[PDB]
RNA sequence: GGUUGCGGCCAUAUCUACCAGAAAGCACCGUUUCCCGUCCGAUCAACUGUAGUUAAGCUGGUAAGAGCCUGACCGAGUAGUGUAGUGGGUGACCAUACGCGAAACUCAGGUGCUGCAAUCU
RNA sequence: GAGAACAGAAAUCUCCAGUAGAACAAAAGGGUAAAAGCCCCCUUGAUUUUGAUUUUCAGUGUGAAUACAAACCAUGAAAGU
RNA sequence: AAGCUCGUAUCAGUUUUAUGAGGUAAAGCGAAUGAUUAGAGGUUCCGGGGUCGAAAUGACCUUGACCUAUUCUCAAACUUUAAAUAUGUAAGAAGUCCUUGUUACUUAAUUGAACGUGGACAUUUGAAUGAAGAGCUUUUAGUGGGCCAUUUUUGGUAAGC
């Protein structure tokens, strides 16, 4: 449903995080930093292995 | 439970009860909205509905005209009509409701102008077909229903009551997706298995596993049938000859009656109490200021 | 009075909390299956926790509800484990009761090291005939006061048949 | 920057109704109105799709059609002196059931039996009821009720 | 008179704490070969009318209960508002003549009503 | 609020009380309970042609809403939308 | 100021009938704004910086965000929605009752509704009934700079606007 992936994207919410937890991971880290718990996010990189986004976020936090 | 919470007196202000027919539960405004009430494209029209209520699988059929003020019952078909004919028991099945639908299609039809018209078939085999009404004149009659609850399922005496009425001249645009013998997979219809629930083939089928298998409930279940000598193919003759009693005299003959509303108007107030006026019961009022609520 | 206001068990509901999904849960499930013959049901985490290590909708626990005869067996069978001694709490004001057991083996059931060792709890909800009034579709009602299951009434019931002991104050 | 474009604008009126309530009272879409039922611009609280001035209030035209929306009416815009043009009506939330064509037809129309009785009786008809003529000299009594002379209480000086 | 299905009626019903229920008419309980519906035959669906039962629900009765409603020259011909008017007054206010005219508190009474069909000593 | 094998004031399961501070597409507030809502299953009438009416208006432009008939679909045991 | 077309012909500073419309009262911040308050006690290879061992996961502090254990629960005038007291529209030859036609709507059913004709309710003909005229079209001039008092309403920290 990557369509609605970008769906929650353009959106998606804290319920959007629920939908996300129900490239591809481009939209991934996208709404990633979006919702940005951070633990969920480390595990995110987890399920993972985008890059730029993550790096920037880490540098800013 | 207000012995623990104990609400205040200001809490009861925005209180609003529903229907009398809601608490006790009798009327619904989501099915009746498309049953009694209707757009003014038809205006004043005696939309007769068939009220069906199977309690303990007991045959109950009621016909009430659609009126906003003052309902008038046209006809009624209960379970105290089959013992009158000759059918003792076995009136709680689908075949009984099937014969009831045909019986109500002759009793109500008698006062519905003519009785010769609106028939169809009398062979009774179980086949999905449409009744051919008389061209130019007698339009195909359509009977309306009135239930409320009862889950949408297959093999219902309530839902199959229209099927029995469909063979009585009553033309209703129904389907065949819910017949006892229908496959959920494909869209094929099997009239062979359908016939089993007409002559009581499914009833005698369970009896075959009682004289060799289930012997414990042999003396318990099926007892009234042995009293009328029903065990062989005599059960089939019951529903078969039941159609002959339908065209006999559908005038609904009253029972014993014996003294209606006259001599039986004095029984309740013979053991219970009543809310008598305080002017006569001053002995109980003056007793409240004595020791009941006046401290000894 | 009493005729027809006996005191059947409505249902026994065994329940296994497991702060995670995966093998360790499908194994808890396997336990409840072979023990009930019924295929058991999974429950998702309601919110996310972190100090419990769970996320919203994770699948975190299985359970299974069991009714009539089969109920009484597993009741007594695990009731054994508890040496026929509950406590004065354990019983709800609305007259049901429960207990936990750990080690689901202390009641029949072998070991199998590729299954592990799980607890053995489950609640027992009691009722009388005519419970249906509060439960059917049409004319749904609430059961009359002098018909409701209570703590007094259920404890006394337990103390009797089973013979088991109540305990505490 | 602003709030328009695709689907926005109008941040002055933003929903429903109340009053009686049972839906809108489930009998609006059922019954079809005819000649007499006026759909006064009622229920505009949530129906202000181009809200008019506060001056337009009270005037009424002539009903000629009943449908989904409302009936045709006029509002003699008494601005300055005479009345301007225009017609109005109202959406669907302003659809009512006027009782003016009810009570008036249960008092005058109810006395139709008193009209068909003059030629075979002797005049004295019509429902032109008398308003309230002053009472003349009536006959009263005294025995059974002893008169009593009252007096206002002496209001003293106090806070 | 009572009871069941189907309406009108929307606190004049429902809730806490009790009592009554000979007949008829409901419900609960029992069954799992077929159909529908679950993690669980509790609810729903299907089948049957032989067996525990006035135990639950409904109804009725009991009540200076609670809540709500009706009535009264009880509160109160009140308060507020309108018209007219050369009364006092700096402002904030307080009256008379001629119409209309608040709520709550106090007191008293009632404790669901009704049509059709069917059943019932 | 009252319980329990793994398990603490939070997680899983069960029961009781309970006339809506909720749910019901954006930010928000009354509704309504054998729900007008949510979930599962079943889906393409959220699309086209021919009329009329309501608010603004000069019985306007644009936009939006309500209510029929005449083709073409879906859901349902029936009555319907 | 200058014209045309008509007649039982335009209604009302006083009294009865309560169907619509509105955003001032109540509530919430648990996805919208704001004055979403005020502290203490821990844990450091490697969240980011020093001193001291040539070193090795040898050791020891301070200065910012959290968790556990408390308090308040966010002003009526940010927005949307939503009441009592109140005010138009309703006033019959233009309408109603009894007998009777038609059609492509409704119904099993010349039944109802909608749509016609004829007769009666005839001086109490649909509260009371004051009242030196009514409707439509066209054109021109002046005016787009005043003040004060009484009653009602908002604001109103002396004198006072």
From Swiss-Prot, chain A:
Signal peptide: none annotated. It is found in: Nucleus, Nucleolus. Belongs to the SDA1 family. Associated with the 60S pre-ribosomal particles. Interacts with NAP1. Required for 60S pre-ribosomal subunits export to the cytoplasm. May also be required for 60S ribosomal subunit maturation and accumulation. Involved in G1 events and passage through start, and possibly actin cytoskeleton organization. Present with 3640 molecules/cell in log phase SD medium. This is Protein SDA1. It comes from Saccharomyces cerevisiae (strain ATCC 204508 / S288c) (Baker's yeast). The lineage of its organism: Eukaryota, Fungi, Dikarya, Ascomycota, Saccharomycotina. The gene is SDA1.
Curated annotation (Swiss-Prot), chain B:
Gene3D superfamilies: 3.30.420.100. One of its GO terms (molecular function) is structural constituent of ribosome. There is a cross-link at residue 163 (Glycyl lysine isopeptide (Lys-Gly) (interchain with G-Cter in ubiquitin)). It holds the Pfam family Ribosomal_L5e. GO terms for biological process: cytoplasmic translation; ribosomal large subunit assembly. The modification Phosphoserine is found at residues 166, 175, 234. InterPro entries: Rbsml_uL18_euk, Ribosomal_uL18_C_euk. It is found in: Cytoplasm; Nucleus. Keywords: Cytoplasm, Isopeptide bond, Nucleus, Phosphoprotein, Ribonucleoprotein, Ribosomal protein, RNA-binding, rRNA-binding, Ubl conjugation. GO terms for cellular component: cytoplasm; cytosol; cytosolic large ribosomal subunit; nucleus. Its main location: cytoplasm. Component of the large ribosomal subunit (LSU). Mature yeast ribosomes consist of a small (40S) and a large (60S) subunit. The 40S small subunit contains 1 molecule of ribosomal RNA (18S rRNA) and 33 different proteins (encoded by 57 genes). The large 60S subunit contains 3 rRNA molecules (25S, 5.8S and 5S rRNA) and 46 different proteins (encoded by 81 genes). Component of a hexameric 5S RNP precursor complex, composed of 5S RNA, RRS1, RPF2, RPL5, RPL11A/RPL11B and SYO1; this complex acts as a precursor for ribosome assembly. HAMAP family: Ribosomal_uL18_A. Belongs to the universal ribosomal protein uL18 family. This is Large ribosomal subunit protein uL18. It comes from Saccharomyces cerevisiae (strain ATCC 204508 / S288c) (Baker's yeast).
Curated annotation (Swiss-Prot), chain C:
Component of the large ribosomal subunit (LSU). Mature yeast ribosomes consist of a small (40S) and a large (60S) subunit. The 40S small subunit contains 1 molecule of ribosomal RNA (18S rRNA) and 33 different proteins (encoded by 57 genes). The large 60S subunit contains 3 rRNA molecules (25S, 5.8S and 5S rRNA) and 46 different proteins (encoded by 81 genes). Component of a hexameric 5S RNP precursor complex, composed of 5S RNA, RRS1, RPF2, RPL5, RPL11A/RPL11B and SYO1; this complex acts as a precursor for ribosome assembly. This is Large ribosomal subunit protein uL5A. The modification N6,N6,N6-trimethyllysine is found at residue 70. PROSITE patterns: RIBOSOMAL_L5 (PS00358). Belongs to the universal ribosomal protein uL5 family. Keywords: Acetylation, Cytoplasm, Methylation, Nucleus, Ribonucleoprotein, Ribosomal protein, RNA-binding, rRNA-binding. N-terminally acetylated by acetyltransferase NatA. Present with 39000 molecules/cell in log phase SD medium. There are 2 genes for uL5 in yeast. The keyword RNA-binding applies.
UniProtKB/Swiss-Prot annotation, chain D:
Gene3D superfamilies: 6.10.250.3260, Ribosomal protein L21. The gene is RPL21A. The lineage of its organism: Eukaryota, Fungi, Dikarya, Ascomycota, Saccharomycotina. The keyword Cytoplasm applies. Component of the large ribosomal subunit (LSU). Mature yeast ribosomes consist of a small (40S) and a large (60S) subunit. The 40S small subunit contains 1 molecule of ribosomal RNA (18S rRNA) and 33 different proteins (encoded by 57 genes). The large 60S subunit contains 3 rRNA molecules (25S, 5.8S and 5S rRNA) and 46 different proteins (encoded by 81 genes). It comes from Saccharomyces cerevisiae (strain ATCC 204508 / S288c) (Baker's yeast). GO terms for biological process: cytoplasmic translation. The keyword Disulfide bond does not apply. Its main location: cytoplasm. Keywords: Cytoplasm, Isopeptide bond, Ribonucleoprotein, Ribosomal protein, Ubl conjugation. One of its GO terms (cellular component) is cytosolic large ribosomal subunit. This is Large ribosomal subunit protein eL21A.
């Amino acid at each position: 449903t990557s369509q609605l992936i970008e769906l929650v994207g353009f959106v998606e919410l804290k319920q959007l995080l629920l939908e996300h937890h129900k490239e591809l991971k481009e939209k991934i880290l996208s709404c990633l930093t979006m919702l940005r718990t951070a633990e969920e996010l480390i595990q995110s990189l987890f399920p993972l292995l985008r890059k730029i986004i993550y790096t920037n976020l880490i540098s800013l936090l | 439970a207000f012995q623990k919470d104990a609400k205040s007196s200001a809490y009861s202000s925005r209180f609003q009860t529903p229907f009398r027919r809601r608490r006790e539960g009798k009327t619904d405004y989501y099915q009746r909205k498309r049953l009694v009430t209707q757009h003014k494209a038809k205006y004043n029209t005696p939309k007769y509905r068939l009220v069906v209520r199977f309690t303990n699988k007991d045959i109950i059929c009621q016909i009430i005209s659609s009126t906003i003020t003052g309902d008038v019952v046209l006809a009624a078909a209960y379970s105290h009509e089959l013992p009158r004919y000759g059918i003792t028991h076995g009136l709680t099945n689908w075949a009984a409701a099937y014969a009831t639908g045909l019986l109500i299609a002759r009793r109500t039809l008698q006062k519905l102008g003519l009785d010769e018209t609106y028939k169809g078939v009398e062979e009774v085999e179980g086949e999905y077909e449409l009744t051919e009404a008389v061209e130019d004149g007698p339009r195909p009659f359509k009977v309306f229903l009135d239930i409320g609850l009862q889950r949408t399922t297959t093999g219902a005496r309530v839902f199959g009551a229209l099927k029995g009425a469909s063979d009585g001249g009553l033309y209703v645009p129904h389907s065949e997706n819910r017949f006892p013998g229908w496959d959920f997979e494909t869209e094929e219809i099997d009239p062979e298995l359908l016939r089993s629930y007409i002559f009581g083939g499914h009833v005698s089928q369970y009896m075959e596993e009682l004289a060799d298998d289930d012997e414990e409930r042999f003396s318990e279940l099926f007892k009234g049938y042995l009293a009328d000598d029903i065990d062989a193919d005599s059960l089939e003759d019951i529903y078969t000859s039941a159609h002959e009693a339908i065209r006999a005299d559908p005038a609904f003959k009253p029972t014993e009656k014996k003294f209606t509303k006259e001599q039986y108007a004095a029984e309740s107030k013979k053991y219970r109490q009543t809310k008598l006026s305080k002017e006569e019961r001053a002995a109980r009022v003056a007793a409240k200021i004595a020791a009941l609520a006046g401290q000894q | 009075q009493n005729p027809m206001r006996d005191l059947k068990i409505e249902k026994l509901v065994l329940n296994i909390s497991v702060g995670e999904s995966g093998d360790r849960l499908t194994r808890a499930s396997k336990v409840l299956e072979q023990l009930s013959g019924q295929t058991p049901v999974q429950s998702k985490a309601r919110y996310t926790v972190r100090t419990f290590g769970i996320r919203r909708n994770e699948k975190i626990a299985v359970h299974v509800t069991v009714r009539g005869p089969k109920a009484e067996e597993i009741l007594e069978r695990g009731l054994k484990v508890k040496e026929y001694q509950l406590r004065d709490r354990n019983f709800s004001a609305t007259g049901n009761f429960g207990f936990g057991i750990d080690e689901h083996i202390d009641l029949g059931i072998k070991y199998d090291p590729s299954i592990g060792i799980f607890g053995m709890d489950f609640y027992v909800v009691m009722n009388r005939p005519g419970a249906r009034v509060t439960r059917r579709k049409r004319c749904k009602g609430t059961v009359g006061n002098s018909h409701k299951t209570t703590k007094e009434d259920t404890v006394s019931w337990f103390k009797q048949k089973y013979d088991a002991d109540v305990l505490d104050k | 920057g602003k709030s328009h474009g695709y689907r926005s604008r109008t941040r002055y009126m933003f929903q429903r109704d109340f009053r009686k309530h049972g839906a809108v009272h489930l009998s609006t879409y059922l019954k079809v109105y005819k000649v007499g039922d006026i759909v006064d611009i009622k229920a505009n609280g949530s129906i202000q799709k181009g809200m008019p001035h506060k001056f337009y209030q009270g005037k009424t035209g002539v009903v000629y059609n009943v449908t989904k929306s409302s009936v045709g009416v006029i509002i003699n815009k008494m601005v300055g002196n005479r009345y301007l043009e225009k017609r109005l009506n109202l959406r669907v939330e302003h659809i009512k059931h006027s009782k003016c064509r009810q009570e008036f037809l249960e008092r005058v129309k109810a006395n139709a039996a008193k009209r068909a009785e003059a030629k075979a009786q002797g005049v004295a008809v019509q429902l032109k009821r008398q308003p309230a003529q002053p009472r003349e000299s009536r006959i009263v009594s005294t025995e059974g009720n002893v008169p009593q002379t009252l007096a206002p209480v002496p209001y003293e000086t106090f806070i």
